[PDB]
């Protein structure tokens, strides 16, 4: 176990979202188009700017939801086939003190709050309810990979960062000891 293992920042990891490992279930394997999400992901930063987590898959107009630090405030975005919607939190994320985050999208309607701030809710444009995932989101950042083109200058960051306590769907991620594609081994040099 590792109930707290943190990050390098030169560490950029595509964790494993979800599968139907038929092998056990004997269900037919499938990349499920989603409509249900959620978590309780804490955070610490100093960077008033940058990107955090992108869910789904990468290709030109390949469905997504994403989170990024925009102007110090924090906006969650997504597109489903009909134009993308943005959900910005009312929190300066610079603290370096520790902040907890929650965000959820039930089909069209999204939701996101930083801390105890009232839940900012939104809606995807009508005529597209599908999000299209592999069942392995990306996190932290990447190299030469920001796809398609729907990116303000916050979605550019290979964000060297330190967080904690990530959740996917209803099930908790054991941080690194069962990390998916593990880049580095070390907890945070914490404030």
């Amino acid at each position: 176990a590792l109930e707290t293992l943190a990050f390098d920042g030169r560490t950029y990891i595509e964790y494993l979202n979800a599968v139907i490992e038929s092998e056990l279930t004997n269900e037919i394997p499938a990349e499920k188009a989603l409509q249900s999400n959620h978590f309780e992901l804490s955070l610490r930063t100093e960077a008033t700017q940058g990107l955090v987590l992108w869910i789904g898959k990468a290709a030109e107009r390949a469905d997504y939801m994403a989170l990024a630090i925009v102007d110090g405030h924090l906006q969650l975005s997504y597109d489903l086939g009909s134009q993308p919607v943005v959900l910005r939190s009312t929190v300066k994320v610079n603290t370096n003190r520790w902040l907890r985050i929650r965000a959820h999208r039930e089909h069209r309607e999204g939701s996101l709050q930083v801390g105890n701030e009232a839940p900012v809710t939104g809606s995807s444009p009508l005529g597209a309810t599908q999000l299209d995932t592999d069942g392995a989101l990306w996190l932290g950042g990447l190299q030469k990979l920001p796809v398609g083109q729907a990116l303000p200058k916050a979605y550019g960051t290979g964000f060297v960062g330190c967080l904690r306590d990530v959740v996917v769907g209803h099930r908790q991620l054991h941080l690194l000891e069962d990390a998916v594609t593990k880049p580095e081994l070390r907890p945070c040099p914490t404030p």
């Binding site: 959900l87 910005r88 309607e109 900012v120 939104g122 809606s123 444009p125 009508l126």
Partner: protein, 330 residues
């Protein structure tokens, strides 16, 4: 402070007549009745009475309402059923008018001049129109819209009004077709739940449930003064009549009144309500006469025309294509 018009001397207008005081402007015709929704019922109350009148009963979740004084109709939305219905104001002959396509049909207004029904859906993020029968249905605005709630019509002025209580908090107006999309107020807003036009006063009033204000603004949104700034824990819907403002408040679960200009004479027209929702003044002068833009004439190109500017513009349903300003075709 002279009701409708001065120049030392006061003046009344249209179907009003200066009271034994020569400042006050009483409306002609029948007694104004306050009409409103209750989630479960639709009810009628008399501004200064205990009075109580159950108009429609077995209803699931009735939020927005409006009427057609002539033609004697009453429309209303239902947020769990996701329908917009109408009835014989009689209270009889109830019938489905907008079936598929609804989520949270918040706003609902009737254009008694051009016989059009307009509504907003804050789940759909769009404003829509239609025939009174519920046919000829067409979406109107989808651009930029977040959470539209209240919707007001000026059939005479051929304009439409609304409130958006999404992340960009707005009170907007456009012409009854979708042109001239303007900002009436975008500042010091957060929860603009209500909005009403006082034609005879040539002003618009709205309600902010976060800011605890009933605001008055000229129709261009200039000269914006808050009229009432207290006793507003959570107001939802508003209506003007004569000198008074009527609104529903979810906290006080009640219909409150107060003075248009002063904000004095704050009153609880009715306490102990289930869940006050949309409210209107039911009265002739609330549906003042106005020239049909499509009158003794081409009543809607092929299908339905939309009073834009002056020159009414032609309009095609969802799925249909224009082909001209006389012609509509799928």
């Amino acid at each position: 402070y002279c009701s409708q018009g001065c120049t030392f001397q006061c003046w009344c207008e249209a179907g009003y007549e200066l009271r034994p005081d020569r400042r006050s402007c009483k409306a002609l015709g029948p007694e104004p009745v306050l009409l409103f929704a209750n989630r479960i019922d639709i009810r009628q109350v008399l501004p200064h009475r205990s009075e109580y009148t159950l108009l429609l009963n077995n209803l699931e979740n009735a939020i927005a309402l409006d009427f057609h004084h002539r033609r004697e109709l009453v429309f209303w939305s239902d947020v769990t059923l996701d329908r917009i219905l109408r009835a014989n104001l009689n209270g009889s002959n109830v019938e489905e008018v907008v079936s598929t396509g609804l989520e949270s049909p918040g706003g609902l207004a009737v254009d008694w001049v051009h016989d059009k029904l307009y509504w907003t859906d804050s789940g759909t993020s769009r404003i829509e129109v239609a025939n009174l029968d519920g046919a000829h249905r067409k979406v109107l605005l989808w651009q930029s819209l977040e959470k539209p709630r209240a919707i007001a019509l000026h059939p005479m002025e051929g304009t439409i009004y609304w409130t958006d209580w999404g992340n960009t908090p707005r009170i907007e107006a456009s012409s009854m077709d979708g042109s001239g999309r303007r900002i009436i107020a975008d500042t010091h807003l957060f929860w603009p739940n209500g909005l009403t036009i006082d034609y005879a006063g040539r002003r618009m009033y709205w309600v902010d449930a976060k800011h605890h204000v009933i605001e008055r603004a000229n129709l261009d949104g200039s000269h914006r003064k808050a009229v009432i700034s207290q006793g507003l824990p959570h107001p939802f819907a508003i209506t003007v009549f004569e000198d008074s403002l009527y609104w529903t408040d979810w906290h006080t679960k009640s219909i409150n009144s107060a003075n248009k200009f002063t904000g004095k004479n704050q009153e609880i027209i009715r306490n102990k309500l289930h869940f006050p929702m949309d409210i209107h003044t039911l009265h002739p002068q609330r549906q003042p006469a106005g020239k049909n833009r499509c009158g003794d004439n081409n009543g809607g190109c092929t299908h339905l025309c939309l009073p834009s500017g002056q020159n009414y513009t032609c309009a095609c349903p969802t799925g249909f294509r224009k082909i001209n300003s006389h012609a509509c075709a799928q």
